[PDB]
Amino acid sequence: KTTRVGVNANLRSEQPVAAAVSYKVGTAGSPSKTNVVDSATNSHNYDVVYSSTGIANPVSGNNEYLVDIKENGVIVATGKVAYDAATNELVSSTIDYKGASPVTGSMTTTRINAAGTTVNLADLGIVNASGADDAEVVAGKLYDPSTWSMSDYAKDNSKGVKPDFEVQIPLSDSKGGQRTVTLSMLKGPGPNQWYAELRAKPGDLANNGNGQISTGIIEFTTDGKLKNTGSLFGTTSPTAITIKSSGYIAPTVTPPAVQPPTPPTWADALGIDEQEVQIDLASAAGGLTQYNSQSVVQSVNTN
């Protein structure tokens, strides 16, 4: 029965972001938006890039997305937008000129320089005069760790998002059978940043259909060394996951405590025991690295 795994693999640092993670509005070979006039009567052509936050939407009643505004491949403005999850209206924007401080968002504009020149969000398609404000970002069908994920893709290849890289982790269960756990990852929009999911085979868990175990944002140093794993392993130390026994029922909580989301639980049919597994991504000889070389699994150690 597997209790500890060591992942030895490299993720190529120059791996380009997938369109499903960072979506440029419009057709290939032409700017997203043309002849956008700023408050100083100057016209621009802009690229508009919506990016997934890597954090499950909705957040406090809103669908949140990252936004970059680019001119000739240079970011002139950036921030986060939040659309009402029910009504699809823009609710808040932190889009401001790049490097701005303090960040000063607007429901109708963004600054494009420190001098305070602005453009209209509507001319960028971030707001919609003839429909739902979120129409153009919704068209991008962006990654979501909860509703449009790599685990969704594993279950149905027409759904969710295909990973940039995967590490398969074979577990021996309490019966000696082999359960495959997979670490699925996407290059994130941030520097040295990746979106990650841990997942069992779809159907191997009783508590969902796609087999997702956990999700998290993984960060690397500028030198390609693992920096942190976000909430991928929760707050465990050492980093670990626990998959509950077949037939495990979480007791009803006593109400200062709140009922935790149903934890990963082995399918009834498997009839196997709780499996707590340390997952070591930072060993001295190996570990999960992010150098500019081929994405590759060097080896996976198990006990």
Residue numbers in the entry: 167 to 469
Sentences from the paper on this structure:
The hook, a highly flexible universal joint that connects the filament to the motor, consists of about 120 copies of a single protein, FlgE23. We examined the structures of large inserts in the FlgE sequence by solving the structures of FlgE from Caulobacter crescentus (C. crescentus) and C. jejuni. We solved the structures of both FlgEcc32 and FlgEcj79 to resolutions of 1.84 Å and 2.45 Å, respectively, using X-ray crystallography. Both FlgEcc32 and FlgEcj79 contain completely different extra domains that are not present in FlgE from Salmonella enterica.
C. crescentus strain CB15 (ATCC 19089) has one gene, CC_0902, encoding a 591 amino acid hook protein FlgE (61 kDa). We crystallized a 32 kDa fragment of FlgE. This fragment, called FlgEcc32, lacks the N-terminal 166 residues and the C-terminal 122 residues. The Cα backbone trace of FlgEcc32 of C. crescentus shows two domains, D2 and D3, based on the distribution of hydrophobic amino acids. Domain D2 consists of β-strands organized like a rugby ball, that is completed with some long loops. This domain is made of two parts that consist of segments Lys167-Val183 and Pro329-Asn469. Domain D2 has a loop that protrudes away from it, while Domain D3 consists of a single segment, Ala184-Lys328. Similarly, domains D2 of FlgEcc32 and FlgEst superimpose with an RMSD of 1.7 Å, and domains D2 of FlgEcc32 and FlgEcj79 superimpose with an RMSD of 0.9 Å. To make a model of the hook, we manually docked the atomic model of FlgEcc32 into the density map of the hook of C. crescentus. The relative positions of domains D2 and D3 of FlgEcc32 need to be slightly rearranged to obtain a relatively good docking given the low-resolution of the map.
